Design a protein around this ligand. Structure first.
Ligand code: UL4
Length: 112
């Protein structure tokens, strides 16, 4: 059993860690807009879009009852980017960096 605000305080530093990464978090800070980004097939491929702003809003409105639900949304965001983008993409490579940062940050948090 987790109290939403307690979980939020525990998890927020990990989300902050992602946001802190500049430029690597920039493609992830707002929801993908396929028309703006010149990726018109995006919503065909990515059925379950996720971004940092969405994760933050879920965290802030207590929609994560349990820490793995948060972790699952972070990895959803990563997996979407790896799925849509080519390995040669700026976004793909940025995503890989974010995943490294996240793993490094979420580990000591889950322990606590
Ligand atoms: C131009 C392609 O832009 C993207 C393509 C795919 C994705 C995902 C998350 O799959 C995201 C983006 N967006 C960006 O790269 C982006 C958007 C806004 C700003 C910046 C930036 O680096 O300043 C970068």
């Amino acid at each position: 059993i987790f109290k939403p605000e307690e979980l939020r305080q525990a998890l927020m530093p990990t989300l902050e860690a992602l946001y802190r990464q500049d430029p690597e978090s920039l493609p992830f800070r707002q929801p993908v807009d396929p028309q703006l980004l010149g990726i018109p097939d995006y919503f065909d491929i990515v059925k379950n879009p996720m971004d940092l702003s969405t994760i933050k809003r879920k965290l802030d409105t207590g929609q994560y009852q349990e820490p793995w639900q948060y972790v699952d949304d972070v990895w959803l965001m990563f997996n979407n980017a790896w799925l849509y983008n080519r390995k040669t993409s700026r976004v793909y490579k940025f995503c890989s960096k974010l995943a490294e940062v996240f793993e490094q940050e979420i580990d000591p948090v889950m322990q606590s």
